[PDB]
Amino acid sequence: KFRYMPFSPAGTPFGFTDRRYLTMNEVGYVSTVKNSEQYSITVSFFDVGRFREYHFEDLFGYDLCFLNEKGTLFGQSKTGQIQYRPHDSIHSNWTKIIPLQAGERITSVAATPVRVIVGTSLGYFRSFNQFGVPFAVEKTSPIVALTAQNYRVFSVHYSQFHGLSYSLSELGTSSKRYYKRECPLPMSLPNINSDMKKDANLDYYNFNPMGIKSLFFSSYGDPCIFGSDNTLLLLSKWRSPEESKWLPILDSNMEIWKMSGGKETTDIHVWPLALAYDTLNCILVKGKHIWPEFPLPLPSEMEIRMPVFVKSKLLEENKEEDKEIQIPVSMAAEEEYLRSKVLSELLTDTLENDGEMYGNENEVLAALNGAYDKALLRLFASACSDQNVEKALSLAHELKQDRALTAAVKISERAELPSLVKKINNIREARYEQQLK
Amino acid sequence: KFRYMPFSPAGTPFGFTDRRYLTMNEVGYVSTVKNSEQYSITVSFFDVGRFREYHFEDLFGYDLCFLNEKGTLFGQSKTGQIQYRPHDSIHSNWTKIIPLQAGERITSVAATPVRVIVGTSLGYFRSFNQFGVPFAVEKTSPIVALTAQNYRVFSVHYSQFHGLSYSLSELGTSSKRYYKRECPLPMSLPNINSDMKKDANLDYYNFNPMGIKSLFFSSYGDPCIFGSDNTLLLLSKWRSPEESKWLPILDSNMEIWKMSGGKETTDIHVWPLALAYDTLNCILVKGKHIWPEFPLPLPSEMEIRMPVFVKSKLLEENKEEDKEIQIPVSMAAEEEYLRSKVLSELLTDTLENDGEMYGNENEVLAALNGAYDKALLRLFASACSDQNVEKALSLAHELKQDRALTAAVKISERAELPSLVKKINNIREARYEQQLK
Amino acid sequence: KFRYMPFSPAGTPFGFTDRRYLTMNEVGYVSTVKNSEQYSITVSFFDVGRFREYHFEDLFGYDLCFLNEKGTLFGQSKTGQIQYRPHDSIHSNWTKIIPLQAGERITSVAATPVRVIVGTSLGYFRSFNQFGVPFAVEKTSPIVALTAQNYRVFSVHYSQFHGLSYSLSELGTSSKRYYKRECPLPMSLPNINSDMKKDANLDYYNFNPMGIKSLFFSSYGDPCIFGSDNTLLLLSKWRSPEESKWLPILDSNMEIWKMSGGKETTDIHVWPLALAYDTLNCILVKGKHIWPEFPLPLPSEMEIRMPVFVKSKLLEENKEEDKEIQIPVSMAAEEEYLRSKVLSELLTDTLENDGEMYGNENEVLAALNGAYDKALLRLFASACSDQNVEKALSLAHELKQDRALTAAVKISERAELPSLVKKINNIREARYEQQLK
Amino acid sequence: DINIDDILAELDKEVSPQQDFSDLMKSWKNERCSP
């Protein structure tokens, strides 16, 4: 029989031990240790120089936690007690108790410099200011996860009688605006793999029936999530809700398989923390405990790469066997052009709506454009070698720089395709007319 | 396994008896009694000064019924026969039979001065004029409930696979417009709980497994519904595409608990009739049977109230105990400021789109603004008494009148907060500058 | 319980044999035969003038197929192997193998003049140009069916956790546009009958666990589908999301019932092919197996009609032995007026947006308007003969031409209703003023 | 009840190379048989 749970992102179960992590992210991590019927909570940072690490005794059993650059929020799901602790001492630590119905429990909490949110098993949404003053109350499908950035908030909802779904909204000073509300989520539930209920796995899924390791906004403010498919998913076109679509941008199983030399090693797992441009920030976990353990390892990094390869063909092309596979130029150029295109489009959306957030992204986009045309030129040259005039000409239309078109003319001459040379220069004339206009 | 069933608003089961109520509302109530192989139906009105109570014998077993100020509509879910009776003698009574498929049944019906509507278990929607002239046929999910106001129609649907959903539409004289079409509906569901196998509960869910008791449009033309958990739910912001949301505006269980002296008087139940401004018309039912009995008890009224309340805090603050429990000034001010803001916004939407329907709403709106600022001034003074300058300053921004800020300045002076006095004076100067633009 | 399977438009199982149909449409059909460990494939056309029937051998055991008047697309659901064949010789065929996760399989495939699409059980969507250049990958609900007509594409999606849904899009070379994305679908499911009846047609449900018998675009690009209940459904007003709606336009069972003289000739089955304006192209299949066999029997033609009738009432009206049942003139006129109205509206929308293909369709629209007024005049005259002036006057509002209103005046004179003559002439004068304005 | 079929008829209504061959067939058949 199914059962609802309280949850916090990137924390861990106890296993059999007396300690666990409540939540973890690129700014820091929260850990706790059991001291008889009392608990010690510690807030740690990946910049302890800026932010004092601090610890205190939890006499309440806080089972919910949220960490940001200003403070840490704690909650007790049964009693409804909550507590906020700023990292500084300019702002006070403060506590509050939230009303709860019989059998109702707080399922998730979130806090930003401009908004605070609480959710419950009976689908009630409550919002507050940074002092705990209430703003509003709303009724939804049951809420199972929350995350936020400035006024932007992303929520996940689930019921057997309404399905699995999400909401995207911005709690602006004008009003709460819904981009999407309780729209179906295209993510594989862990219980689809019903037969994998081994003892070590069963503890984790009793701790986290949803299976999701984390959910967060990108460095560019885009929603992202990592599920039981061991794949990182990113929501594209979220700023344009008519056009929104989820993209699988990185599979950890494929990467670890390749990194092992194309081998099925059952021994290493990835714990995600945050996505920064093209690179996932994550912790590498090993062995039966698929959740990270104590002492916490040092963070690692991994690049996003598109799911566009076949294992058997990769092994045959590769044919020191543990060294990562040698990928053909065709496959490499293919994935490069797709990844360049995806990254350029997402960054374009970022800059067109929110501007330069770091002050250099124009350079990144220019570099991506160069990589894109160079990838296409590799694929074009391969097509010319195959003498497929139509496919070669189709690829020519996708280039962006007249330098690349000129290089394509040279390649066509080397390929001895005068018809293709003529048609490419017709395209260059057409683009020159477009450049004149 | 599950079976779809017919519904009429605020009608009762038979219980262990030969009589029941078919439907009840602000216009009146329809009751019937068994007489051998026949039934006698009586149409009673809460204004028999305008209307006349009348009765007739039913040989068809009309298991569905709907009442308005023009007439009464009757229907048979199995045979598909329907009948409309105007209250006047200007226009005639008439009957019709709807073309139901094998295995199909009519689930609910509705009538307005311009239209008559029929819905079925197999999701077929059929529409006619007040004489029975047909207009169209349309397909949805299985329909489970219906209600209407002039041209506005509000429908509820259920599927084992699509879940629970609702639609809101207007049969405009130009064309039919959908405001929402089978969007998910957030009501609580009773039947999974084993406690529902109590005798009085089990009869209702055999009579009505949905657990809904009634649904209707507000006194300002907004959808409202009363569900299995005895909470009144209102669809807010329905005129706004990106803001439409369901609001829990009254917990009758909480009101009974307080009004009984903080006591668990589960021998009391509420039967809803209609909503007028901030006050719900209803019957207060007492005894085992949760539905009203014979002869019909008298109308009662209850106010909508925001869910701020905590039982333990109210008991402690309160500590003849049957008298309604004490509410602190902080809770009262918070609840008032929320309720005043909600009422003002709903009424604003009404006047901007529906205008003054009653000819006094500008006066109510002015009173609501005064109540809003006064409640915030109580909370402001509390923050000043706590010497929290930031919280007091944030509360000062919420005040509307410059007169309110003048009061806030004087409160700040007596609270000995000169920094707050200076900052509020800056706000007053800034607002006066803005008023001079 | 449900399980995922491949599909193609109107294929057949092997049954007891070594051959089957892979798919059918208005252009033609595809068949194949098994030869020990190899397969032979044959391609047929109804336009024998335009195309050549041909055949070739498959060693790989394709199980997916898609046809248009440019070429044919073939696929293997387990191995991921695919092939596209133009109808011309000039553009040589090409092949590719697509990556698949463990146990993943291709469920459907489709193609436009320049776009290639693939879907899988695990909800992955992949797309390529006409020369196999990859464009994009997306993660959605699992797809169960696909169809296309020029740049317009229509998709169906289903999940245990998200219900049944559909999408509509237009892959314009200027730009790609979405009209609907995985919005709920009201289709009739077959699972209850499959679980209870044990009819020995289980092989068809194994072959088609969705029971979606076929789907295609109309001869004017409207989306259409044929249900497991053997009913034809069409999506109207798709260009306008607040007005878009599903319409039931033909029940095959009701036609066979009348055709048989009101009898239950369940030995007869209807196999749909394509929709041509107002007429269904179909095969009438007799015997054990509810789908056709080789050599292909000749097709039939059948008109759509609105569902308005009742078996018992028509039997009573009726009351040589197989003579088709006689119908009241009221039902016939009513059905004609509804059918004329729907047809005229759909044709009007087509002309409003896409114009005439041939230069004469406006004349058909004029004929439909004439039929509409003619049907209304018969219904009006019936109301007048019944002396129901109120209903007759209400019907008179719906007439278009003053010719018909003049006839209505004569009809009123025959009915000896000078009050109705007066009020019709008031309406005629009012409408004449509106025509003068 | 009121008939309108004539009203509908009056409302609704608001040498060729083909014919010559029929006349030829007629003439041929009649000429063959008559005495």
UniProtKB/Swiss-Prot annotation, chains A, B, C:
Transmembrane segments: none
Ranges for the WD repeats: 227-267
Location within or outside the cell: Nucleus
Other facts noted in the record for this chain: Present with 3280 molecules/cell in log phase SD medium.
Protein purpose: Accessory factor for DNA replication. It plays a role in accurately duplicating the genome in vivo.
Name of protein: DNA polymerase alpha-binding protein
Parent sequence residues shown: 473 to 927 of 927
Swiss-Prot record, chain D:
Annotated transmembrane regions: none
Localization per record: Nucleus
UniProt feature coiled coil, ranges: none
Superkingdom in the source lineage: Eukaryota
Function summary: Required for DNA replication. Functions as part of the GINS complex which plays an essential role in the initiation of DNA replication by binding to DNA replication origins and facilitating the assembly of the DNA replication machinery.
Family per similarity comment: Belongs to the GINS4/SLD5 family.
Subunit structure: Component of the GINS complex which is a heterotetramer composed of SLD5, PSF1, PSF2 and PSF3. Interacts with PSF2.
Protein name: DNA replication complex GINS protein SLD5
Species whose genome carries this gene: Saccharomyces cerevisiae (strain ATCC 204508 / S288c)
Portion of the full-length sequence here: 2 to 74 of 294
